[PDB]
Every structure is written in structure tokens, then in C-alpha cells.
Amino acid sequence: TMYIAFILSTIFVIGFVGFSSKPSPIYGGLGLIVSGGVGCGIVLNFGGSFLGLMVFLIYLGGMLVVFGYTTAMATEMYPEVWVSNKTVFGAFVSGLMMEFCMVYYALKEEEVEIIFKFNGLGDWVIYDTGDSGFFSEEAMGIAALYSYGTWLVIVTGWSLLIGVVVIMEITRGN
């Protein structure tokens, strides 16, 4: 078992609690980067190496722009950190306490939330016995974006081109 997926999921939730308590965009980006790396680990354990590395790389690139933007647009004299503010620390502690409570309840008994029913057992239990051979199912399914999914490529490329046009138009001014 080793509970590696559960530990990683808990760290994922912790990073979300951080950047959602919202200290300041520098530390929000730091927490989001931690969460992206940990999610890469979770999906690597579940099987998708390409998907994990891709989401990690995309969020590393995206948060690089956010740093430059918060240096220019979203900075103040004394940037707030988690312990610097009463509201930020309160929200951070609330999120951590909620995560701890739900984790403890799930481990102690099969916890049914007011939304969904969860069973405390093995993420290794839920896996499938069967195997593939001499190819990666994830890689083949992703590579099927060009043979299958011609429509998806068309709409995605159109959206990206129009996105360039839009960002040029919004920031025109005048």
C-alpha cells in the first residue's frame, strides 16, 4: 500500500489551501507550483507519465508569467505572507483543520460526505489486474488526437489563433 497516493493527495490539498488563503501572488504561485508538482506525482503513480510531466511543464511556464506580472501589477510595499495577516492565517488554519478532520474521519471509518460516499481502503485495491503489451495505452490515446479527433484539433487551433487576436485587441487602448 504505502499510502503514497494518499500522502500526495494531502500535500495537493495543502498547496491549494495555501494559494487559496491568498497571501500574495508570489506565494500563491509558489503554492500552485508545489500543487502542480505533487499532482504530477499523483498521476505518475496512477499511470500517466506524459500527462503528469505535461501539466507540470505547463504550470511551470504559466507561473513564470505570473511572477513577472505580480512584480509589475500586483505588488505592494509589504507583501503579505501566511503569518503576516490575521485573515490569511485564519483561512489557512481553517483549510488545514478541515483537511485534517476529513482525513482522520476517512481513515477511522468509511466517511460518507454530505455530497459523496467515500470508502477508506486501498488505492492499490481499486487498480486493474490486466496489462498491455509493447505500447503505452496513455501514449497511444494521446497520439490519437491527430488520427481521431480531427474536429478537436480544428476547434483548438482556431481558439488559440483567436486568443492571440483577442489579447492583442484587449490591450490596444486608445
Partner: protein
């Protein structure tokens, strides 16, 4: 050849799990050993919990993560 070996190994582990379940759940009031959770009588591929359930953590880990962690 590996297909035949796989079928024999899976069925053997299932039979052993069934025997251990019969030994364990002998005093449970409403419990039928070997009862399927599916309405259909068609053969259903076991999940890793059904095969490596009553086994050591070493075997469980090898079966569930050995390939992914092998680098």
C-alpha cells in the same frame, strides 16, 4: 503460453482466497462465501484487491507498483 499461465495463476489465487474467506467468515450471521456482487453470471476480471488482498505488503506492492517504480 503466458496466457495459459496467467489463467491458471489467477484461478488458483481466487480459489485460495475463497478457502481463506470460508475459514474466516464462518461465524458471520448473514454471509455467503463466494457470493458475486454482479447480477450477471458472466466471468468478470478480478481487481487487484480480490487477488492480492489477503497477502503480504511486499507482494501487494510488487503487483500494484512494481512496473511503475522500476527504473
Amino acid at each position: 503460453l503466458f496466457q495459459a499461465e496467467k489463467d491458471r495463476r489467477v484461478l488458483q489465487m481466487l480459489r485460495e482466497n475463497l478457502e481463506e474467506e470460508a475459514i474466516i467468515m464462518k461465524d458471520v450471521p448473514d454471509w455467503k462465501v463466494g457470493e458475486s456482487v454482479f447480477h450477471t453470471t458472466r466471468w468478470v476480471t478480478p481487481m487487484m484487491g480480490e487477488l492480492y488482498g489477503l497477502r503480504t505488503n511486499e507482494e501487494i506492492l510488487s503487483a500494484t507498483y512494481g512496473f511503475i517504480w522500476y527504473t
